[PDB]
Amino acid sequence: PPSIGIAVILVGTSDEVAIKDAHEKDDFHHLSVVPRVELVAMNETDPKSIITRICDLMSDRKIQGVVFADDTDQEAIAQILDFISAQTLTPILGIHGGSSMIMADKDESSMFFQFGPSIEQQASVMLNIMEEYDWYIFSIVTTYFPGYQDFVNKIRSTIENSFVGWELEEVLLLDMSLDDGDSKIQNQLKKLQSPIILLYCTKEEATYIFEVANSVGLTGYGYTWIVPSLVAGDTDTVPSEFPTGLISVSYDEWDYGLPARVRDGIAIITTAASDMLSEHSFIPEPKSSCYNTHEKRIYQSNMLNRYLINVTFEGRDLSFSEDGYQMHPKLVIILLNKERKWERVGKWKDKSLQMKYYVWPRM
Amino acid sequence: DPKIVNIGAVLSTKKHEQIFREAVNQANKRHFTRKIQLQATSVTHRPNAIQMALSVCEDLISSQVYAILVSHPPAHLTPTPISYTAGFYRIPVIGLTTRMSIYSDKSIHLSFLRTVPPYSHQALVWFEMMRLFNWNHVILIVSDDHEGRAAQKKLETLLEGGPKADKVLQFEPGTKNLTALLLEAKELEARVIILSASEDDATAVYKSAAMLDMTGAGYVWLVGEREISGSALRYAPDGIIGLQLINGKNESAHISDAVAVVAQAIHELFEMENITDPPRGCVGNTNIWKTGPLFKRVLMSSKYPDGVTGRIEFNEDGDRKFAQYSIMNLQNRKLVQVGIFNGSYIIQNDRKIIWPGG
Ligand SMILES: *[C@@H]1O[C@H](CO)[C@@H](O[C@@H]2O[C@H](CO)[C@@H](O[C@@H]3O[C@H](CO[C@H]4O[C@H](CO)[C@@H](O)[C@H](O)[C@@H]4O)[C@@H](O)[C@H](O[C@H]4O[C@H](CO)[C@@H](O)[C@H](O)[C@@H]4O)[C@@H]3O)[C@H](O)[C@H]2NC(C)=O)[C@H](O)[C@H]1NC(C)=O
Ligand SMILES: CS(=O)(=O)Nc1ccc(OC[C@@H](O)CNCCc2ccc(Cl)c(Cl)c2)cc1
Ligand SMILES: *[C@@H]1O[C@H](CO)[C@@H](O)[C@H](O)[C@H]1NC(C)=O
Ligand SMILES: *[C@@H]1O[C@H](CO)[C@@H](O)[C@H](O)[C@H]1NC(C)=O
Ligand SMILES: *[C@@H]1O[C@H](CO)[C@@H](O)[C@H](O)[C@H]1NC(C)=O
Ligand SMILES: *[C@@H]1O[C@H](CO)[C@@H](O)[C@H](O)[C@H]1NC(C)=O
Ligand SMILES: [Cl-]
Ligand SMILES: [Cl-]
Ligand SMILES: [Cl-]
Ligand SMILES: [Cl-]
Ligand SMILES: [Cl-]
Ligand SMILES: [Cl-]
Ligand code: NA
């Protein structure tokens, strides 16, 4: 069988050896096409470094697809990858780190897919948590970080269509594209009454927001804050501003390790290529250049997407949504305990919530 | 020896680069520049979006620009790569000529101002016309895309904060026969029709409307600028009224005003304490410019009364306020100016309006 190039790009320290091992199911591609995998190390995660690295790869070698993992909390990495994906029409999987942090409104032409939960799924996991503990009275805080509308909408849709006595008291929209010298954000947060607050924003934004919220007495006992995966981010990095008792939905590498993720990435791209080749007797030619994409564009498309989203491997459904998220991730509910360590306190699995505690111990 | 503060620009031609240079040199003469002195750094547009992003890093951000002016090239090449790359560091981008409403969306373009208004702000002029000519019942037809819906949202906000929209009809962009949509409008009593649509979509509307005899006496048609440009003009019904943004395509005029505004803002910025320099280059740099959000606020709240393009302020989306429009009326198949919107007020000139039919 013919070989397709797949770059695996790794930012920050990782066991390359352990990674190359999990892919020894390389004897486990019996498809129309076999992966030629190339581990590539990257040091930097600015836009230039990321663009030039991937474009250099694409020019030196024929790359059908990119598997990308990093060890940062930089959600902009996903945005950069979607952009590159759409411009070059190359499959990119963001499987770990900033690269997997929710990127809402991916480009029409994007072939960028992320491990981890959609926004709407996390919204619903939050309401399920709140329902378990009969916390029916709550407020929402977001920034303008993309997705915040989908988050608020999904909450609102859910609660207005149920007979549970939900009370959404207040929705705050914080503008952190301007400086906060007039104490605007303090003044907005001072409005908050509810004993539950849902917060949608980035990890960096949450760091400032919590600092302010502390100053006006909103983080102690009596207030429980609940945040999505990207706010917890890398759970070994805990800002001092984060309040103990913070709850988060998480997909940071708990049971689904990087080696297994890289292997599933390679499988997804390889299976998709085989499926397309089987049906159409071609696959898309790898772009030889980033820098010629304007010419070459009537000759390219995102055809491979239809297949990229519908892969099963070793009898596991690795489907993506059309919005570019994992379909059925096993989510982990985590709590920031008194030692400022994140602690497993429940699972979301088979669209069902199983929580460790029936009553919350003090935090 | 003053501190040198670089301003960046991505512009259409070398001529416009030279105009940028000279505007910055004038700003330095005008202002007191013992402490702070501006330096122009510029390129022209790259042929694709990835090259363009790379050049923003290599040519502009390497020079530690505090802001970047961007023109819309008149050749598929948008400000967007420049907004993205600068926005990554919270370096403000000033759009000079881009009119698309999507650049008003803070979630996508989180440090973007412009000295021209988005197409959707043409609703502000429609509203004043509706009061002036006492059109108290209108039908609004818009394309079901972002631009169309932005026009709707803007007009509805003005109407819901007098005249009323008796109905709103949306249609799918690229639909060629629109008889079903327009028959729906024909059924209604109101006969003032307002349209938001791209060139080609306006063309399709005009054609279908003609075949349904909806372009003659009794009807008023009120549109913006795209809908009397290019092919849209070619099939537009006589008596139509539309708009042209005065100086809207004059890159040179907007370079002048933008530089004046940015120079004023930079001197104001450096009155304050604890101003930091932007990052030098992209490589290895992933933190935001800590002073970026403050400089954005100072720009947002800048006023420049004596601009080439009129009175320059920005609204809460960073969009130009007090923009001036020609009010155009298609008579005997010539676009004729029948007035202006001077930024806050309608001024009818001594040319008579001719309506559909009469
Ligand atoms: C777009 O067009 C509009 C309307 O033409 C302009 O707005 C007007 O700007 C002029 C300045 O040239 C203003 O004229 C001044 O009006 C003052 C009184 O204003 C009150 O009364 C008027 C009329 O009823 C109201 O519209 C207004 O809201 C106030 O309630 C006068 O006191 C001024 O006179 C002073 O200066 C003259 C010099 O000629 C002296 O002789 C006088 O002694 C005195 O010192 C002056 O006449 C006018 O008020 C503005 N109108 C509105 C509605 O705001 C915009 O400026 C224009 N925009 C641009 C960009 O050109
Ligand atoms: C306004 S706020 O309160 O501060 N919240 C907020 C936070 C983040 C945010 O990011 C939105 C933009 O990045 C999306 N588009 C830019 C992403 C992008 C794409 C390609 C490249 Cl090449 C780069 Cl470099 C960057 C938008 C808003
Ligand atoms: C990354 O840094 C390491 C050591 O600091 C170096 O060996 C490696 O060559 C660097 N990678 C690149 C792409 O420069
Ligand atoms: C593709 O999706 C279809 C749904 O019609 C289903 O048969 C299956 O999940 C996928 N096919 C595969 C994986 O061969
Ligand atoms: C564009 O504006 C400039 C002012 O900077 C002016 O000199 C020039 O005449 C204008 N061009 C047109 C076509 O009006
Ligand atoms: C910045 O503020 C700090 C106070 O923490 C002060 O020590 C320093 O002199 C200031 N620098 C400038 C340039 O304002
Ligand atoms: Cl690197
Ligand atoms: Cl894009
Ligand atoms: Cl996420
Ligand atoms: Cl962050
Ligand atoms: Cl650089
Ligand atoms: Cl007139
Ligand atoms: Na803006």
PDB file of N, CA, C and O in Angstrom, chain B residues 125 128 131-132 322-325 327 339-348:
ATOM      1  N   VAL B 125     -28.881  56.361   8.348  1.00  0.00           N
ATOM      2  CA  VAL B 125     -29.315  57.324   7.348  1.00  0.00           C
ATOM      3  C   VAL B 125     -30.737  57.024   6.896  1.00  0.00           C
ATOM      4  O   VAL B 125     -31.542  57.942   6.702  1.00  0.00           O
ATOM      5  N   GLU B 128     -33.237  58.406   9.409  1.00  0.00           N
ATOM      6  CA  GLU B 128     -33.415  59.854   9.347  1.00  0.00           C
ATOM      7  C   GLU B 128     -34.240  60.244   8.133  1.00  0.00           C
ATOM      8  O   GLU B 128     -35.021  61.199   8.180  1.00  0.00           O
ATOM      9  N   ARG B 131     -37.972  59.532   8.947  1.00  0.00           N
ATOM     10  CA  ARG B 131     -38.558  60.667   9.678  1.00  0.00           C
ATOM     11  C   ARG B 131     -38.800  61.848   8.743  1.00  0.00           C
ATOM     12  O   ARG B 131     -39.893  62.415   8.712  1.00  0.00           O
ATOM     13  N   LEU B 132     -37.795  62.178   7.945  1.00  0.00           N
ATOM     14  CA  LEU B 132     -37.857  63.350   7.095  1.00  0.00           C
ATOM     15  C   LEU B 132     -39.011  63.237   6.109  1.00  0.00           C
ATOM     16  O   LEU B 132     -39.857  64.119   6.032  1.00  0.00           O
ATOM     17  N   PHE B 322     -20.211  59.749  12.773  1.00  0.00           N
ATOM     18  CA  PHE B 322     -20.244  61.045  12.090  1.00  0.00           C
ATOM     19  C   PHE B 322     -19.705  60.929  10.670  1.00  0.00           C
ATOM     20  O   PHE B 322     -19.189  61.890  10.110  1.00  0.00           O
ATOM     21  N   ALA B 323     -19.942  59.779  10.056  1.00  0.00           N
ATOM     22  CA  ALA B 323     -19.615  59.579   8.669  1.00  0.00           C
ATOM     23  C   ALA B 323     -20.605  60.326   7.787  1.00  0.00           C
ATOM     24  O   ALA B 323     -21.763  60.472   8.135  1.00  0.00           O
ATOM     25  N   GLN B 324     -20.149  60.726   6.611  1.00  0.00           N
ATOM     26  CA  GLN B 324     -20.944  61.537   5.713  1.00  0.00           C
ATOM     27  C   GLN B 324     -21.240  60.782   4.431  1.00  0.00           C
ATOM     28  O   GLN B 324     -20.357  60.165   3.850  1.00  0.00           O
ATOM     29  N   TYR B 325     -22.489  60.864   3.979  1.00  0.00           N
ATOM     30  CA  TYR B 325     -22.942  60.104   2.828  1.00  0.00           C
ATOM     31  C   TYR B 325     -23.540  61.040   1.790  1.00  0.00           C
ATOM     32  O   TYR B 325     -24.283  61.957   2.129  1.00  0.00           O
ATOM     33  N   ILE B 327     -26.460  61.234  -0.814  1.00  0.00           N
ATOM     34  CA  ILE B 327     -27.738  60.611  -1.085  1.00  0.00           C
ATOM     35  C   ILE B 327     -28.052  60.664  -2.589  1.00  0.00           C
ATOM     36  O   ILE B 327     -28.139  61.737  -3.172  1.00  0.00           O
ATOM     37  N   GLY B 339     -28.759  65.048  -2.155  1.00  0.00           N
ATOM     38  CA  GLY B 339     -28.453  65.600  -0.840  1.00  0.00           C
ATOM     39  C   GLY B 339     -27.259  64.931  -0.202  1.00  0.00           C
ATOM     40  O   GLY B 339     -26.580  64.125  -0.834  1.00  0.00           O
ATOM     41  N   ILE B 340     -26.986  65.282   1.056  1.00  0.00           N
ATOM     42  CA  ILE B 340     -26.016  64.558   1.847  1.00  0.00           C
ATOM     43  C   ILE B 340     -26.509  64.335   3.266  1.00  0.00           C
ATOM     44  O   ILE B 340     -27.366  65.072   3.771  1.00  0.00           O
ATOM     45  N   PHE B 341     -26.010  63.275   3.888  1.00  0.00           N
ATOM     46  CA  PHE B 341     -26.078  63.136   5.321  1.00  0.00           C
ATOM     47  C   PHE B 341     -24.749  63.534   5.940  1.00  0.00           C
ATOM     48  O   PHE B 341     -23.714  62.934   5.645  1.00  0.00           O
ATOM     49  N   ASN B 342     -24.757  64.648   6.669  1.00  0.00           N
ATOM     50  CA  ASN B 342     -23.527  65.367   6.982  1.00  0.00           C
ATOM     51  C   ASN B 342     -22.896  64.828   8.264  1.00  0.00           C
ATOM     52  O   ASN B 342     -21.954  65.418   8.802  1.00  0.00           O
ATOM     53  N   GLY B 343     -23.401  63.695   8.732  1.00  0.00           N
ATOM     54  CA  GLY B 343     -22.889  63.079   9.951  1.00  0.00           C
ATOM     55  C   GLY B 343     -23.926  63.031  11.058  1.00  0.00           C
ATOM     56  O   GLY B 343     -23.843  62.197  11.958  1.00  0.00           O
ATOM     57  N   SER B 344     -24.890  63.951  11.009  1.00  0.00           N
ATOM     58  CA  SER B 344     -25.944  64.004  12.019  1.00  0.00           C
ATOM     59  C   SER B 344     -27.253  64.567  11.448  1.00  0.00           C
ATOM     60  O   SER B 344     -28.275  64.581  12.125  1.00  0.00           O
ATOM     61  N   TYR B 345     -27.207  65.040  10.208  1.00  0.00           N
ATOM     62  CA  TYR B 345     -28.291  65.862   9.662  1.00  0.00           C
ATOM     63  C   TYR B 345     -28.432  65.655   8.144  1.00  0.00           C
ATOM     64  O   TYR B 345     -27.440  65.625   7.421  1.00  0.00           O
ATOM     65  N   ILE B 346     -29.675  65.539   7.676  1.00  0.00           N
ATOM     66  CA  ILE B 346     -29.953  65.473   6.242  1.00  0.00           C
ATOM     67  C   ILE B 346     -30.031  66.864   5.635  1.00  0.00           C
ATOM     68  O   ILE B 346     -30.794  67.710   6.090  1.00  0.00           O
ATOM     69  N   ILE B 347     -29.290  67.061   4.553  1.00  0.00           N
ATOM     70  CA  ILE B 347     -29.316  68.309   3.814  1.00  0.00           C
ATOM     71  C   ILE B 347     -29.697  68.032   2.369  1.00  0.00           C
ATOM     72  O   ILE B 347     -28.963  67.373   1.656  1.00  0.00           O
ATOM     73  N   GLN B 348     -30.914  68.404   1.992  1.00  0.00           N
ATOM     74  CA  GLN B 348     -31.350  68.280   0.602  1.00  0.00           C
ATOM     75  C   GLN B 348     -30.783  69.416  -0.234  1.00  0.00           C
ATOM     76  O   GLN B 348     -30.878  70.578   0.140  1.00  0.00           O
TER      77      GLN B 348
END
